[PDB]
Design an enzyme around this catalytic site. Sequence first.
Site, short mmCIF file in Angstrom:
data_model
loop_
_atom_site.label_atom_id
_atom_site.label_comp_id
_atom_site.label_asym_id
_atom_site.label_seq_id
_atom_site.Cartn_x
_atom_site.Cartn_y
_atom_site.Cartn_z
N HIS A 121 19.19 -13.24 -23.24
CA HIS A 121 20.57 -13.71 -23.21
C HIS A 121 21.53 -12.68 -22.63
O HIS A 121 21.29 -11.47 -22.69
CB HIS A 121 21.10 -14.09 -24.61
CG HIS A 121 20.06 -14.66 -25.52
ND1 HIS A 121 19.60 -13.99 -26.64
CD2 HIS A 121 19.38 -15.83 -25.48
CE1 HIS A 121 18.70 -14.73 -27.26
NE2 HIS A 121 18.54 -15.85 -26.57
N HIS A 127 24.82 -11.00 -23.54
CA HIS A 127 25.65 -10.71 -24.70
C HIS A 127 27.04 -10.28 -24.23
O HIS A 127 27.24 -9.91 -23.08
CB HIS A 127 24.99 -9.63 -25.58
CG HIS A 127 23.81 -10.13 -26.37
ND1 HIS A 127 23.74 -10.07 -27.74
CD2 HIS A 127 22.66 -10.73 -25.96
CE1 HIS A 127 22.60 -10.61 -28.15
NE2 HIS A 127 21.92 -11.00 -27.09
N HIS A 178 25.94 -13.36 -28.52
CA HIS A 178 25.71 -14.02 -27.23
C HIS A 178 27.06 -14.31 -26.57
O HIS A 178 28.02 -14.72 -27.23
CB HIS A 178 24.90 -15.31 -27.38
CG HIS A 178 23.53 -15.12 -27.96
ND1 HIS A 178 22.65 -16.17 -28.16
CD2 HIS A 178 22.89 -14.01 -28.41
CE1 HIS A 178 21.54 -15.71 -28.70
NE2 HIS A 178 21.65 -14.41 -28.86
N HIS A 189 25.57 -21.55 -25.43
CA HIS A 189 26.39 -20.42 -25.03
C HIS A 189 26.25 -20.18 -23.53
O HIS A 189 25.20 -20.45 -22.94
CB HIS A 189 25.96 -19.14 -25.76
CG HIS A 189 25.98 -19.24 -27.25
ND1 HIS A 189 25.03 -18.61 -28.04
CD2 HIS A 189 26.84 -19.84 -28.10
CE1 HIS A 189 25.30 -18.84 -29.31
NE2 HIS A 189 26.40 -19.58 -29.38
N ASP A 232 23.13 -18.17 -22.82
CA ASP A 232 21.81 -18.64 -23.24
C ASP A 232 20.91 -18.89 -22.03
O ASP A 232 20.93 -19.98 -21.44
CB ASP A 232 21.94 -19.91 -24.07
CG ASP A 232 22.59 -19.67 -25.40
OD1 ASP A 232 22.66 -18.50 -25.80
OD2 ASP A 232 23.02 -20.65 -26.05
N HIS A 248 14.53 -10.05 -26.47
CA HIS A 248 14.38 -10.09 -27.92
C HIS A 248 12.93 -9.98 -28.36
O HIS A 248 11.98 -10.12 -27.59
CB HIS A 248 15.00 -11.37 -28.48
CG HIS A 248 16.48 -11.32 -28.54
ND1 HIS A 248 17.17 -10.89 -29.66
CD2 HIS A 248 17.42 -11.60 -27.61
CE1 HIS A 248 18.47 -10.94 -29.42
NE2 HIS A 248 18.65 -11.37 -28.19
N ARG A 258 16.52 -6.91 -31.12
CA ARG A 258 16.83 -6.65 -29.72
C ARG A 258 15.97 -5.48 -29.23
O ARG A 258 16.23 -4.33 -29.59
CB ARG A 258 18.31 -6.34 -29.53
CG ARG A 258 19.21 -7.39 -30.12
CD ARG A 258 20.67 -6.99 -30.06
NE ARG A 258 21.47 -8.05 -30.66
CZ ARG A 258 22.80 -8.13 -30.60
NH1 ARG A 258 23.51 -7.21 -29.96
NH2 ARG A 258 23.41 -9.15 -31.19
CL LIG Z 1 29.23 -16.16 -29.87
CU LIG Z 2 20.24 -12.13 -27.15
S LIG Z 3 21.34 -11.83 -31.30
ZN LIG Z 4 23.18 -18.25 -27.69
#
Ligand SMILES: [Cl-]
Ligand SMILES: [Cu+2]
Ligand SMILES: [S]
Ligand SMILES: [Zn+2]
Lengths: 151, 151
Positions: free
Chosen positions: B44, B46, B61, B78, B81, B118, B141
């Site tokens: 993702h 972040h 995220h 998100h 994502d 992750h 992470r």
């Molecule tokens: Cl968020």
């Molecule tokens: Cu992530």
């Molecule tokens: S996360």
């Molecule tokens: Zn997400």
Amino acid sequence: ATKAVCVLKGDGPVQGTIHFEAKGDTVVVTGSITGLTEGDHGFHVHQFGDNTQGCTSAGPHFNPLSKKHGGPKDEERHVGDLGNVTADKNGVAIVDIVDPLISLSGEYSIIGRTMVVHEKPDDLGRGGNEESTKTGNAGSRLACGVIGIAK
Amino acid sequence: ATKAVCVLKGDGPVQGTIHFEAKGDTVVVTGSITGLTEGDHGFHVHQFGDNTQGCTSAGPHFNPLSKKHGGPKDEERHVGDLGNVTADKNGVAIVDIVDPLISLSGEYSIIGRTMVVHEKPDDLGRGGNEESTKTGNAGSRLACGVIGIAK
Ligand SMILES: [Cl-]
Ligand SMILES: [Cu+2]
Ligand SMILES: [S]
Ligand SMILES: [Zn+2]
Ligand SMILES: [Cu+2]
Ligand SMILES: [Zn+2]
């Protein structure tokens, strides 16, 4: 964006965390760098936030106006030219720079670019040779980091 | 920018380089991650390009539209994502993602934010529990980097 942060790392002991804050039409650059030799060290925003080959891949000083290298006080300077940071006997450089040319947004945004601290002093474009007009003869790149958005 | 790059590092063995290229209104994401366990691993953007506290300081995220977590193909997701990368037996994941929601400029820009890979698979918001709608239960992470402007 009004706040940014940069963590400096290199192959040796140099380290530091730099914070950026937008104030009026300036960027306030604060923080501290440790592990340096006593005295002055060049300090610039470089063009690319590319660490694939260490600090080498950051490219040259950020210079969208294609001007000659200078100090932060000079009209003729690169956008990324922030001059020298100064380490004490203890190798601690207190970073305290207010700059009107770098920005955290728009064309001169340094978000996603690279901060680099150097092995030797930046001669501020007054060294008398071709290299002074490009890099200020600041020498090797000791540590660097990509400038990121901060909370 | 129109091209970006991200070098992943962590406290363990996971490393990688991610490449980004704008194509029309999409971002083409390529590269590779090494040192992973076999299988799927959440992946993702972040929110913060803040590496002061390892990957923890990257924040949640990237979610400027304040939606629930999902998979990249879902409408409810998100911005950050990007789903799962898949590592083979030798621990290498080849990244091949084209995304219409992330951007390299403007409001949805991920320049200066952080890529994170992750510990566990991302359940794409279909796990049934509270954490699934927030993180996809992807766990710890392993590695991260600030997304930088590339040449
Ligand atoms: Cl968020
Ligand atoms: Cu992530
Ligand atoms: S996360
Ligand atoms: Zn997400
Ligand atoms: Cu420099
Ligand atoms: Zn310069």
